[PDB]
């Protein structure tokens, strides 16, 4: 009765560790692209247009139809829909690095997707939630969070690019140091997520939601790859586009759900972003292993 709270110690630690992860991953990845190739990919919107069209025309529609045909409740359908309309993430960049893709297309694709999310999230949210949500959902959108995510994506990559271009020697040392610190932050994130999933087992969720969260990333990957192939794209550009379409951001969904509904209405969905990220990581690792095995053979 006195405390009434006290869940801060682990959540803030996880947030700061993930922020350090993102900063250092962008640092280590900004030495793998060139500014000239970035503007070459930007001036030609073939990849950008396909990625944006897929992410904002098929993923929201896929989430909506999955929620409608899977007989999901209002809160579960809202969660899956907000996850569907979210922009791409940086796991997409990491996977593209590990899938031998065009990293000059990855950063431009992610930045354009995030800006288009700032522009289009209220629109898609209103259109697809006029049925499953009586109130307005346009206000709950975290514009400031998206803006700071854009800043945190751009600044480390920009400084890494200018460091590699001007001082090649410093690049190797900072890359090695970033890898070293990421190695420990990885075990930190792993143990924190292990505790979170251990508690999520006790506070279990709807298994239909689990099926939908498993189906969504695979459908995203397949549809992105098919759309890129049908548009006569390059071999590595196809993989980059598919891997960017498959991976979505889940922090925005958590923020929107927390703002829109009381904690007791969310309930089991407190660990939905963790489950979605776990499914994304598992399917992406499986696809990466399959691609590497095919390439070696």
């Amino acid at each position: 009765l006195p405390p009434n709270f006290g869940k801060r110690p682990t959540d803030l630690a996880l947030s700061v560790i993930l922020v350090f992860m993102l900063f250092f991953i962008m640092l280590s990845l900004g030495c793998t692209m060139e500014f000239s190739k970035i503007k070459a990919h930007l001036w030609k919107p073939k990849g950008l247009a396909i990625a944006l069209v897929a992410q904002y025309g098929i993923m929201p529609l896929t989430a909506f139809v999955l929620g409608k045909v899977f007989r999901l409740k209002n809160i579960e359908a809202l969660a899956i829909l907000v996850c569907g309309c979210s922009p791409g993430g940086n796991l997409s960049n990491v996977f593209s690095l590990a899938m031998k893709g065009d990293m000059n297309l990855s950063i431009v694709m992610t930045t354009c997707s995030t800006f288009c999310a700032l522009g289009m999230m209220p629109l898609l949210l209103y259109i697809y939630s006029r049925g499953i949500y009586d109130g307005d959902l346009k206000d709950k959108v975290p514009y400031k969070g998206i803006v700071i995510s854009l800043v945190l994506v751009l600044i480390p990559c920009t400084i890494g690019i200018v460091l590699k271009s001007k001082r090649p020697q410093y690049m190797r040392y900072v890359i090695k140091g970033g890898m070293i610190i990421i190695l420990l932050c990885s075990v930190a994130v792993t143990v924190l997520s292990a505790i979170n999933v251990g508690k999520s087992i006790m506070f279990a969720m709807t298994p239909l939601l689990i099926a939908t969260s498993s189906l969504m990333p695979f459908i995203g990957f397949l549809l992105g790859y098919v759309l890129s192939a049908l548009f006569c794209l390059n071999g590595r550009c196809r993989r980059t586009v598919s891997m960017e379409t498959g991976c979505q951001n889940v922090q925005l969904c958590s923020t929107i759900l927390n703002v829109a509904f009381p904690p007791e209405v969310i309930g089991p969905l407190f660990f939905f972003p963790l489950l979605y990220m776990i499914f994304q990581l598992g399917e992406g690792l499986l696809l990466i292993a399959i691609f590497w095995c095919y390439e070696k053979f």
Partner: antibody
Amino acid sequence: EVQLQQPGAELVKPGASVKLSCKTSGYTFTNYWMKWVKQRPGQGLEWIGEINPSNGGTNYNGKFKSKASLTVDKSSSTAYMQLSSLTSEDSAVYYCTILVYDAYYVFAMDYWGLGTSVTVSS
Amino acid sequence: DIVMTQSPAIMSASPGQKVTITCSASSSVNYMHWYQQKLGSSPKLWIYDTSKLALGVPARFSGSGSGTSYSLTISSMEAEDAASYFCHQWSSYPRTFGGGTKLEIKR
């Protein structure tokens, strides 16, 4: 010691309007949603709506959207419900409620108000 | 909106008789919760998430069920249990309460 204070009874005339108040003390006001519940003598409990003191977001009942209107004054840490066009079927007891709920440390607790016996007089 | 029906509407039991009250919804309810109201007082949360107990609730109260059928069981009813019990869902808006079950004392 969370405590929500409400008036005892407010007699009104049919077709008029009333503004019920709920004053909170003993907890961070902008940390939990405030819900409003209606209890008619003879029927069961009904849920009117919710309001977030720190954001102002409001979910309402389908049948109480055109009748109730929740407001918040964080300066005095007070919540308000404005009832309008009060017919004879609006005589009930109105409670203001807050629910402390954590799934991290799984636990739940309620804090209700004593109620406000609104009776249309005529 | 989900409509809940609570049975029985009125009951009588002895101080020690095992008692069970049922609530059946009109649609799939993901969790169900129970509220206790003593006469001349405001309702209080009693059991949430179909199995848990709020602060101050004695260990004699338990909950069970799923789908569209849930139940509240008291093993050894005492003299301080004559009240009104309501079932409540807050997972499918709008939130709805049950009709109410009046548990009295037999003599």
